[PDB]
């Protein structure tokens, strides 16, 4: 009954995510599940301090996701 | 009073099979072309004669 | 060696461990029972508020929406 989210429009694009405690992150979307857990390649950190830290291939749980922002035109 | 009737489909199939002599083998109104009531009324109003039709 | 958390909680039941909650307080006790829903029951535990002892309370049932994690020793 759990329908997957239509994130086909945002595949392989540069998007910035907002997380719970005023947190911010960026990177390339690579896939999803029907629980909106997101895999992100080339993940740079970009906290509220102002310094940028690349990590790589990461997984964000969907419960702390606030908003998606497509920097590249989809 | 014997006014209305309704049957079943094998009954209608059998009564259609028995009556095959008094019926035509037509399927569509591509027959009677220029040989129906309206063409006969048109030939009536124009005072012409269809070949096979009335005068 | 794939060790899932469910045989971890159904295998080491009885060892003196410490659970740590969402509020930051810590319960030292040995695990009595645990279900598939991951509610937990531990006996004769002790209360550390930020590492500092507060008092004696007893044996504790802990619920899913209160726990942070479960570590050993």
């Amino acid at each position: 009954k759990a329908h997957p989210p239509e994130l086909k429009k945002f595949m392989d694009k540069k998007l910035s995510l907002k997380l719970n405690g005023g947190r911010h992150v960026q990177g390339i979307l690579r896939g999803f599940d029907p629980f909106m857990n997101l895999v992100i390649d080339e993940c740079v950190e970009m906290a509220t301090s102002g310094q940028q830290n690349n990590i790589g291939m990461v997984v964000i749980r969907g419960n702390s996701i606030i908003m998606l922002e497509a920097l590249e035109r989809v | 009073t014997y006014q209305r009737w309704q049957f079943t489909l094998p009954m209608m199939s059998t009564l259609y099979r028995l009556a095959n002599q008094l019926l035509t083998d037509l399927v569509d109104d591509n027959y009677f072309y220029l040989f129906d009531l309206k063409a006969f009324f048109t030939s009536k109003a124009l005072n012409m004669a269809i070949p096979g039709g009335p005068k | 060696l794939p060790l899932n958390p469910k045989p971890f909680l159904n295998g080491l039941t009885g060892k003196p461990v410490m659970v740590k909650l969402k509020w930051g307080m810590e319960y030292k006790g040995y695990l009595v029972s645990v279900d598939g829903y991951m509610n937990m029951q531990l006996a004769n535990t002790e209360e550390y508020i930020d590492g500092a002892l507060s008092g004696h309370l007893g044996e504790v049932l802990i619920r899913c929406n209160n726990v942070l994690y479960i570590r050993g020793v």
């Binding site: - | 006014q3 009737w5 309704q6 079943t8 094998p10 199939s13 008094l22 399927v27 040989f35 096979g52 | -």
Partner: protein, 105 residues
């Protein structure tokens, strides 16, 4: 449009049969791959699979679909017996060939 209905001459044939009166169809797409496996649930079946494709009353019911009035009905009113022309189709259709002159008149 030309009704292309074909009459049934053998009761032992299936009702849906490729009659050789019909001209043959001269035989010869983005299909997805088998590995992205779409699995249906177990109790999902095609519709009406318990009923057969045809019964004994199917071809007769199709033949009565193109029958003249009243043989295409299944309910109606009774008519008084002098108001049923049994010969109206005969002189309404056409003249058969080879009839004498007085028959055409």
């Amino acid at each position: 449009p030309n009704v292309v209905f074909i009459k049934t001459e053998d009761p032992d044939l299936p009702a849906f049969y490729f009659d050789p009166l019909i001209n043959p169809i001269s035989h010869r797409e983005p299909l997805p791959d088998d590995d992205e496996e779409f699995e249906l649930p177990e109790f999902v079946e095609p519709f009406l699979k318990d009923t057969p494709l045809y019964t004994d009353n199917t071809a007769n019911g199709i033949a009565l679909l193109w029958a003249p009035r009243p043989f295409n009905l299944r309910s109606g009113r009774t008519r008084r017996a002098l108001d049923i022309p049994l010969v109206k189709n005969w002189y309404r259709e056409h003249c058969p060939a080879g009839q004498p002159v007085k028959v055409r008149v």
